[PDB]
Design a protein around this nucleic acid. Structure first.
Ligand SMILES: [Mg+2]
Ligand SMILES: [Mg+2]
Ligand SMILES: [Mg+2]
Ligand SMILES: [Mg+2]
Ligand SMILES: [Mg+2]
Ligand SMILES: [Mg+2]
Ligand SMILES: [Mg+2]
Ligand SMILES: [Mg+2]
Ligand SMILES: [Mg+2]
Ligand SMILES: [Mg+2]
Ligand SMILES: [Mg+2]
Ligand SMILES: [Mg+2]
Ligand SMILES: [Mg+2]
Ligand SMILES: [Mg+2]
Ligand SMILES: [Mg+2]
Ligand SMILES: [Zn+2]
Lengths: 68, 96, 100, 55
RNA sequence: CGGAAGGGCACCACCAGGAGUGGAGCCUGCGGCUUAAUUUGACUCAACACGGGAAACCUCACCCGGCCCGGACACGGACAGGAUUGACAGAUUGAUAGCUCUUUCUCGAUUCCGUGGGUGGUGGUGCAUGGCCGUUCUUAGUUGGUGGAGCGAUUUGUCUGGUUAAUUCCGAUAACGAACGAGACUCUGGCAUGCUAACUAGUUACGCGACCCCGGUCGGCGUAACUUCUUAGAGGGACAAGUGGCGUUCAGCCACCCGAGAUUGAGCAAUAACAGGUCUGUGAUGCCCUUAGAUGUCCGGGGCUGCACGCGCGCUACACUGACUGGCUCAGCGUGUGCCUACCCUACGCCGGCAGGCGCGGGUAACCCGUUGAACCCCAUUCGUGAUGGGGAUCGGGGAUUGCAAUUAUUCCCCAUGAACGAGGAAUUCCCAGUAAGUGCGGGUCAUAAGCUUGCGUUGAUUAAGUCCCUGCCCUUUGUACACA
């Protein structure tokens, strides 16, 4: 068959090293904290986190969304 | 094939608990009737049991619209140490 | 105390040999039995084009399947006639037993 | 999403809903008395099921 | 094979006829044109209402777009400091396909990347095939063994004659003994007042009820006999048996008595074949093609219905032997609540002109639909030879049902529109007794569903008991320069 444009490009995973570094408070004072928001998910109580953008929060396993 | 390993060990668990496996030729029907305890479609699979066939662990026959698969002695030895079963955990094939 | 069996099959001679050797036993078990009452026989007809494709003379098979069925009544207690339900059975006949 | 869309089309009716119970074929089906097998497969299996041509 | 001869045969031949068809409108298939695609197979019998092919989607194989891997397995790679799943917004899309784009999250060895290979295909090849079907070919034909005749291919048996539906028999006989086909066979139709039996079939009695005038009607209600009607089993029955002619007095034929039947209709169907059809029935299948930007598969839309022409199968008709409107009165086959699987057949009450709808019930069925109140036919009205109240194409407006969705109108209704068509050229099809023909009802197809097909009844003939003229078939003899004939 003939075609029209070049093929629609597949979504690529942007390779980031240590993808947990956006999340926790590491300092010489003996503290630990969370940068992003914890999920209010019923099935995932306090395990994982949201996708804090500048616009809205997203958690993955529950597909949860809380905007502003 | 992509599938949870939980669905995968439920399939091999049924293949152990009765040493055969039957599936209607349907890659569209929502769920296996015997395996209604798990969220496993016939779409979610018959081709992995073909994978056991193509590795040599089951032998396949295909009547009218229904696959049938049979466990082998080559297959039981692999599957028990895939599902981390001892020699004490055996099918109806090893027991009277 | 009044039971009724329905004998249903496709082959009439092995239906009516069961339907006779049950009645012969029922008359020597000192009962009051009504004999075979014969329902009209259900012939199942399928007319089909013989050719797998659409070529040739338009020829048709007229396949048939005749199903025969009897009623036998027993004015008898149950275990007095529960032998003949599970004895004198041949692999062709289905039995449908009712009481009420 | 493909997983919630691959089997959302309603084939609850039509001849796409049905197939031969020997062939998985969609034409020549005999639904009479629930045979649900195509005309040529029924030609193959009519004596085996018990339909004798005597007329 | 013969536009050679002899003997027979067949309404896919003819005669005598019947209904037609070919003429018109429409349906539907085919060709052609057109188109993004108008998918394709089949082209004398033996393609052309065929592929069970009545396609809105699906089907679907065609076309225009967009997803998915549903690429097993092996090897090497990356890979828990993450191989990779999935995604709400907002763009984008046709779309609530995270299909992609920007943003980040989630998921956790199930994967992915390559390399070999595999899988799938309504892709091709029926001129590679199997199976099935059709056809030669509905006629009577075909073949061994042993023996005989020929160098042989071959021939005889398998035939001069009579006879038969028949290579069916008698008979003849270098053949004898056989095998298939034919016949026999199974189903079906017709017949039993004798058998078996019947609260899921009834009949007759008797009791009661209702209406009329002791009786009559009642599919109104109920129980003592019986199986005539019904059901379906066992048997019986019919054999050219009996009589009279014809006949080698054989094989057999004609007519008649007695009787239900003195020829019911099918099914199965030999050897050899055919480049017949089917790869689009198949997880029957060789080879080839293709395999992630797919000829896999899915979704959305469209096409298969497209329209200067030609053809085939059909339906409606061209009217008074009819139409319309009332009344009356009779069937036989069936099918029916589904492994997936949603979709059954309907009694009856009420609302609605109508299609329909809203409620309770029965039936997995000789139980309910149902006593299947079918049509044609029959009796009574109105018409009046007028393209008329024949005919109902085309087209307009509205109303219901099925469906996720009906527009290129799914189907059904209502009103209105009221075309050709005045019995069809050359030509040509099917058929002889419950036959043709008319007439409706089932089944299949079916969510909605018959102008088709397969069955069933109902009403029911004209003509024929023959021939080889036409078209073909069989046998023998004969001729041949034919032998893919
Ligand atoms: Mg004749
Ligand atoms: Mg004539
Ligand atoms: Mg015409
Ligand atoms: Mg249609
Ligand atoms: Mg589609
Ligand atoms: Mg379509
Ligand atoms: Mg295929
Ligand atoms: Mg062929
Ligand atoms: Mg050919
Ligand atoms: Mg078409
Ligand atoms: Mg007029
Ligand atoms: Mg009219
Ligand atoms: Mg002719
Ligand atoms: Mg048709
Ligand atoms: Mg000469
Ligand atoms: Zn089939």
């Amino acid at each position: 068959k003939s075609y029209t444009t070049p093929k629609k490009n597949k979504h690529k995973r942007k390779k980031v090293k240590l993808a947990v570094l956006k999340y926790y408070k590491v300092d010489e004072n003996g503290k630990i904290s969370r940068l992003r928001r914890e999920c209010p998910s019923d099935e995932c109580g306090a395990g994982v986190f949201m996708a804090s953008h500048f616009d809205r929060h997203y958690c993955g396993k529950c597909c949860l969304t809380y905007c502003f | 094939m992509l599938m949870p390993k939980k669905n995968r060990i439920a399939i091999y668990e049924l293949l152990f608990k009765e040493g055969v496996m039957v599936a209607k030729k349907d890659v569209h029907m929502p769920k296996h009737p015997e395996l209604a305890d798990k969220n496993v479609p016939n779409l979610h699979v018959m081709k992995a049991m073909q994978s056991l066939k193509s590795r040599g662990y089951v032998k396949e026959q295909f009547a009218w619209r229904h696959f049938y698969w049979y466990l082998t002695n080559e297959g039981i030895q692999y599957l028990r140490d895939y599902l981390h079963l001892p020699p004490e955990i055996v099918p109806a094939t090893l027991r009277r | 105390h009044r039971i009724r069996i329905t004998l249903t099959s496709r082959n009439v001679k092995s239906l009516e040999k069961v339907c006779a050797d049950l009645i012969r036993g029922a008359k020597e078990k000192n009962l009051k039995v009504k004999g075979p009452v014969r329902m009209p026989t259900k012939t199942l007809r399928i007319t089909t084009r013989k050719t797998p494709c659409g070529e040739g003379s338009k020829t048709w098979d007229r396949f048939q399947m005749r199903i025969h069925k009897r009623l036998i009544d027993l004015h008898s207690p149950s275990e007095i006639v529960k032998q003949i339900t599970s004895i004198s059975i041949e692999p062709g006949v289905e039995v449908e037993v009712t009481i009420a | 999403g493909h997983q919630q869309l691959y089997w959302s089309h309603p084939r609850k009716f039509g001849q796409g809903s049905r197939s031969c119970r020997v062939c998985s074929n969609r034409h020549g089906l005999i639904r009479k008395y629930g045979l649900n097998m195509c005309r040529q497969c029924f030609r193959q299996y009519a004596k085996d099921i018990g339909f004798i041509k005597l007329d």
